[PDB]
């Protein structure tokens, strides 16, 4: 207390801060129900936008109160300054998106390597086209990093910029100008209190003086200290990069002012990064004597350093390095048009860090790292050691290594479970026992899907999943297998396969896709829920019975609140209101703290809706369903499979059966960068929506009467949810979802009017039972060189016009380059040469057998023209070619050449 107001900070919840400011905008100083149920009726209710919130909080903090909003630590920002930084960055990020040679609007990872490689190849192409019949030519690149981008930059350069933007109007340009000028005249940084006490005591008893950081304070009499032109790093990664590119084109337009030489300088700018080039033609000698240098990289470095020094950019000579073949963007320095793989970072992160929350999720993150290191051109013998390395870190850090306490195989053997070793699920302490291909292409859901597929194949007594598809899709077969299961269970003549199946169905019963089951909590939020004020408002407004039935009654009054995401007011704050650690738990693990340890692991092992949903999610998965058959019938080598052997099988069989099963690529050896193609997280969110409605319905019926198996015929909502929960409610809502198609229109007035039960928890998640997608895997760069069958037939249907130009082409050209060839040999090579993992002749044959059968039948003209109109329109050019090898019938050929190749109102 030095006639000031010292105050330490406290990190609260961001959602709670938005909830508080949305409250205090609406004069909502004290929590009360009736002040918000009065208004906000449906989509015609009250609404608020972002920018009026922004100017409201801005007008609130325009009053002088000590500038508590402008008090930030490093890597941290207050709520209002997050709002203004958000406003600047998220109004300017589309302007950054509009620049084709800039990379702060990257698509995560692939755009970096793709854009750096295209910059390199277009630059080298420009060099090559200027190499022809020219006087003199020289080219060089630059990968540059700046010294202190956060603190050397003058923020006032931005003040001269915002007023020049035509995207705004008079008043919001002034809004951004005023927030920027408020950001620079009130900025202060709060020193941590413990180091403040340490340094103050050290000055008091030993020093009686201080270093530079103490001279800002008046003899250490103030807690905080101001920085003026330092916007902290990571806050403005968009605007600064684009204006740094503005300085780049300032350099360009400065260099066309030179007379005797021509320059074309393109650039890539990342935050804290450069990658540029320069091209000079003509009299280079007088140019280099003009700039006083002997090499073009020397002149480029000196010019770029002077230009950056002219506009408050400090370039660091120790880290910026410019040569004739390298570009270092963050990593993967590409030389001479060829990228270095650089799996050192991936294999290093394999054994240097983890997320450090739980065993399973650390195993998931390191497994993602395994997929990255396998996907980036892995070397020869380090795959099994990498498997063992991620496994031994998952074992040694949290869930102890085998041979001692907290084991997985030992617990299963001491329980005498019939499961063998290489099929234990990964949540059950099971090791990463999946092979290379399913982990490589999928990631998280590889091993669990493999073991579930194998045990469904075992119990279902089929041989392959193509049998399983049309066996399961026919109704009442699963019911008869389940009833013979019940007969076998009551009889007592069960075998080991039935025991494995009942263990896996009860394991999936207590599960998500793959949850943790054993979930020890942290320090329980019951002592930290008082930090959140939403819990205070939840508990501010015999008595427990009436209060919980009352609040559940006010959920039943408007059931659409808890189940749709907040669309308008009266559905957001009610919805939110009504909803070094490794060193700690290496000591906390081996303990009886939560009254059980490694006996809870075995007591879960101690004890058809789940069956049909699990076999459905086995069979409704798309990429796994095409993943297995290319494994089980795969050739070892040749046809652009094995041309070399130095880590060469580690790229080709990883993806050529997979990626060429899709179109868009012809190459053999290339490091790939995939999308988020595998989306198993679209079946789980309808199930969770059903879980909230089942919870709400169960609470409502259990709190209106006891021991409910059926209702006593109350209202129609209770009656229809009695139809919902009579059997398994998730199963019935997904089953009826395959032929109901409501999609009500989100007006909050006709939604309650149409049907108050089924579209509430079936159509208010914006998702239902549908089919995922398989991509082309997005090959990033070349290295150093029943539902299946319909969509696949549609692939051939749309590819028919292409293969009518491809197969005829290759047949004519092989007939050209062999004139002694026979028709049996044409059949043989056309049976063997494949495109998009489809043999040509059988793909044509399955389509043309039905049209020959339709033509040879007794149908008339109108029954044949309308049957195969697309087919006949495609085969107009090569009908004779189909007749040549005896494929097309003469009746079909005659049909094609005759009909195709020509009172009251």
């Amino acid at each position: 207390y030095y006639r000031n107001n010292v105050t330490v900070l406290k990190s609260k919840k961001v959602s709670e801060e938005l909830y508080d400011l949305v409250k205090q905008f609406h004069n909502m100083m004290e929590i009360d129900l009736d002040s918000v149920m009065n208004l906000g009726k449906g989509t015609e209710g009250k609404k608020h936008t972002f920018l009026q919130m922004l100017e409201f909080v801005m007008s609130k903090a325009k009053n002088v109160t000590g500038s508590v909003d402008f008090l930030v630590s490093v890597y941290l920002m207050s709520m209002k300054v997050k709002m203004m930084l958000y406003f600047i960055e998220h109004t300017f990020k589309h302007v950054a998106q509009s620049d084709p040679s800039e990379a702060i609007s990257i698509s995560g990872d692939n755009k970096i390597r793709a854009l750096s490689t295209l910059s390199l190849d277009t630059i080298t192409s420009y060099n090559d086209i200027l190499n022809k019949n020219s006087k003199k030519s020289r080219l060089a690149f630059l990968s540059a990093d700046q010294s202190k981008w956060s603190a050397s930059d003058l923020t006032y350069k931005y003040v001269l910029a915002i007023i020049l933007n035509p995207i705004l109007t008079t008043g919001e340009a002034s809004l951004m100008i005023e927030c920027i000028l408020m950001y620079v005249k009130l900025k202060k940084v709060c020193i941590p209190t413990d180091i403040f006490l340490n340094l103050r005591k050290a000055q008091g008893t030993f020093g009686q003086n201080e270093t530079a950081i103490g001279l800002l304070t008046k003899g250490l009499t103030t807690n905080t200290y101001p920085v003026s032109m330092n916007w902290l790093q990571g806050n403005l990664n968009y605007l600064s990069s684009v204006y740094h590119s503005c300085a780049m084109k300032a350099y360009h337009k400065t260099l066309e002012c030179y007379k005797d030489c021509d320059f074309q300088t393109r650039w890539i700018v990342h935050s804290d990064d450069n990658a540029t080039s320069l091209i000079a033609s003509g009299e280079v000698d007088k140019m280099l004597t003009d700039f006083s240098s002997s090499s073009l990289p020397e002149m480029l470095f000196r010019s770029i350093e002077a230009h950056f020094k002219s506009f408050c950019i400090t370039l660091n000579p120790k880290k910026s390095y410019a040569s004739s073949s390298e570009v270092e963007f963050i990593s993967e320095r590409i030389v001479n048009g060829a990228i270095i793989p650089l799996y050192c970072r991936h294999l290093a992160n394999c054994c240097t860090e983890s997320s450090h929350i739980s065993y399973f999720d650390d195993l998931m993150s390191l497994s993602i790292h395994v997929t990255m290191l396998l996907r980036k051109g892995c070397p020869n013998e380090v795959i099994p050691f990498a498997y063992g390395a991620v496994q031994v870190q998952a074992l040694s850090i949290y869930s102890m290594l085998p041979g001692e306490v907290n084991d997985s195989i030992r617990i299963f053997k001491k329980l005498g479970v019939s499961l063998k070793s290489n099929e234990i699920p990964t949540n059950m302490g099971g090791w990463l026992t999946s092979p290379i291909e399913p982990l490589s292409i999928l990631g998280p859901s590889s091993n669990d899907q493999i073991i579930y597929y194998n045990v469904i194949r075992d119990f279902l007594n089929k041989k392959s999943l193509e049998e399983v598809k049309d066996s399961v899709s026919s109704s009442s077969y699963l019911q008869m297998r389940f009833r013979e299961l019940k007969g076998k269970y009551e009889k007592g003549t069960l075998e080991e396969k039935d025991k494995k199946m009942i263990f896996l169905i009860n394991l999936f019963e207590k599960a998500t896709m793959l949850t943790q089951i054993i979930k020890l909590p942290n320090f329980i939020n019951e002592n930290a829920l008082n930090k959140m004020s939403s819990y205070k408002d939840f508990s501010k407004l015999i008595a427990s019975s009436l209060e919980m039935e009352s609040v559940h009654d006010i959920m039943i009054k408007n059931p659409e609140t808890i189940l749709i995401a907040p669309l308008n007011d009266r559905d957001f704050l009610l919805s939110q209101l009504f909803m070094k650690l490794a060193l700690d738990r290496v000591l906390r693990s081996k303990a009886r703290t939560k009254m059980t340890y490694e006996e809870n692991m075995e007591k879960k092992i101690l004890e058809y809706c789940s069956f049909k949903t699990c076999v459905n999610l086995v069979i409704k998965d798309v990429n796994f369903s095409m993943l297995i058959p290319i494994l089980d019938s795969a050739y070892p080598c040749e046809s652009r499979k094995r041309d070399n052997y130095n880590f060469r099988w580690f790229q080709t069989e990883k993806w050529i059966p997979v990626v060429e099963g899709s179109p868009g690529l012809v190459v053999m050896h290339a490091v790939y960068g995939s999308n988020y193609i595998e989306n198993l997280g679209l079946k789980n969110i309808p199930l969770t929506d059903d879980s909230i409605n089942v919870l709400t319905s169960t609470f409502g019926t259990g709190l209106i009467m006891e021991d409910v198996k059926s209702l006593v015929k109350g209202k129609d909502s209770f009656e229809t949810e009695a139809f919902s929960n009579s059997n398994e409610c998730q199963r019935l809502v997904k089953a009826c979802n395959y032929m109901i198609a409501a999609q009500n229109r989100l007006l909050a007035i006709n939604t309650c009017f149409t049907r108050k039960s089924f579209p509430f928890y079936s159509k208010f998640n914006l998702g239902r039972g549908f089919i995922s997608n398989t991509l082309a895997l997005l090959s990033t760069i070349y290295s150093k060189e029943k539902t299946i069958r319909t969509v696949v037939s549609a692939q051939q249907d749309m590819n028919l016009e292409k293969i009518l130009d491809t197969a005829v082409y290759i047949s004519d050209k092989l007939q050209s380059l062999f004139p002694t060839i026979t028709r049996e040999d044409i059949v043989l090579i056309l049976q063997n040469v494949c495109l998009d993992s489809k043999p040509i002749w059988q793909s044509l044959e399955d389509k043309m057998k039905k049209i020959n059968n339709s033509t040879a039948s007794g149908f008339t003209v109108s029954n044949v023209i309308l049957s195969h109109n697309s087919e006949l329109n495609t085969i107009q050019k090569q009908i004779v070619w189909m007749w040549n090898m005896g494929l097309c019938s003469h009746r079909t050929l005659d049909f094609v050449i005759r009909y195709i190749r020509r009172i009251g109102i």
């Binding site: 598809k469 049309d470 058959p629 290319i630 019938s633 795969a634 050739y635 070892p636 080598c637 040749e638 046809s639 652009r640 094995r642 179109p663 868009g664 999308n675 988020y676 989306n679 549908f770 089919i771 995922s772 997608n773 991509l775 082309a776 997005l778 069958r789 319909t790 969509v791 696949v792 549609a794 249907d797 749309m798 004519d812 050209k813 007939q815 050209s816 380059l817 062999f818 004139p819 002694t820 060839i821 040999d825 043989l828 090579i829 049976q831 063997n832 494949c834 993992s837 489809k838 043999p839 059988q842 793909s843 399955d846 008339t860 109108s862 029954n863 309308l866 109109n869 697309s870 329109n873």
Partner: protein, 184 residues
């Protein structure tokens, strides 16, 4: 979707689909000229266009690909049920009047001493080199000999001598002109 001309194009295609399908299912008392008009613009002209637009969109593979899959898969189901309902309509009209993917492998085809795997690749490179008027690369001649590929894999030996002078070459009609415009 936002991408200007293609956005308007594939908006126009499916609004045409939906309007023509509701107009075909609007009224039907007469005979099958209604379905005969409905068939070619409900099945042929627009479905394969959406199938094409799924597999040729490149900048929407990370932002709009699961959207486009849910569009075109429902289009596939729409095509199949169109075929079924049209067959039902025909049956009324004239009365009133899996393992296909698993046929791959066994792909080492050799004719004589030359492999019939690198011939196709070398000859398409030959056509590419003649099209842009460039010299053939030596590396395209690497995959000709069978002895490099004979160290691993099963060998299929088809006894055909390398004969290149008889009648059946004459029916190809593939660029008979000899173009050597740098050669004396």
């Amino acid at each position: 979707i936002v991408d200007d001309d293609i956005r308007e194009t594939m908006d126009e295609f499916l609004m045409n689909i939906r309007d023509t399908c509701l107009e075909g299912l609007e009224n039907c008392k007469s005979v099958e000229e209604y379905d005969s008009y409905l068939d070619e613009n409900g099945f042929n002209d627009t479905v394969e266009l959406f199938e094409n637009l799924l597999r040729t969109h490149d900048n929407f593979e990370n932002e709009y690909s699961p959207l486009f899959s849910e569009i075109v898969d429902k289009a596939k189901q729409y095509t199949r049920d169109l075929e079924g309902f049209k067959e039902i309509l025909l049956m009324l009209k004239y009365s009133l009047i899996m393992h296909a993917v698993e046929l791959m492998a066994k792909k080492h085809i050799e004719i004589g001493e030359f492999n019939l795997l690198g011939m196709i690749q070398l000859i398409k490179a030959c056509e590419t080199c003649h099209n842009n008027d460039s010299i053939l690369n030596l590396a395209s001649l690497r995959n000709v000999l069978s002895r490099t590929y004979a160290t691993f894999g099963r060998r299929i030996r088809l006894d055909h001598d390398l004969d290149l002078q008889n009648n059946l070459m004459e029916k190809s009609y593939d660029f008979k002109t000899l173009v050597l415009p740098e050669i004396k």
